[PDB]
Amino acid sequence: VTLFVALYDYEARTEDDLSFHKGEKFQILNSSEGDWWEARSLTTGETGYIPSNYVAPVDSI
Amino acid sequence: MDAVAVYHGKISRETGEKLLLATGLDGSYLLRDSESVPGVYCLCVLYHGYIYTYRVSQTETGSWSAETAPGVHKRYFRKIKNLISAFQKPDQGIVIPLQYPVEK
Amino acid sequence: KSLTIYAQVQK
DSSP states (O other), rough: OOOEEEOOBBSSSSBBBBOOTTOOOOEEOOOSSSSSEEEETTTOOEEEEEGGGGGEEOOOO | OOOOBBBBOOHHHHHHHHHHHHTTTTTTEEEESSSTTTEEEEEEEEEEEEEEEEEEOOOOTEEEEBBBOTTTTOBBBBHHHHHHHHHTTSSSSSSSOOOEOOOO | OOOEEEEOOOO
């Protein structure tokens, strides 16, 4: 597993959160945390935490 | 959450003042537990002979925030380590930027 | 007696 895509839009709740739209693709930098993963947007290059359940592997049915 | 190097846990207010005064440097800082309120923490920074204490706490959603002056917009952070980084920068609203971490 | 001052974020 390497790339993930956002399933739904999301407004950052905190300063270290990312704001992304449906379809936006990511690269996971830290999948250690429970429901919050650190990641980089491949659309903006920005880094930040994202909701674990708002994304799914790009090779998703 | 709270596994940062400057977190000292349950140390007394006076113990925190000592550790900071020892460095003799403005901007030296540490993080400890509040002496009487569960779930509340104190960010301590030395500036011109005094230890400035900012109260830090979580919300229901588990986001961290430092006590803000009335009329000023609060800022939230998922990880306490990002709240600290944000305050290492100049003109962020505190007496002096966090500069010398006093690790446990 | 105490060097601690309770502060708040100004910005």
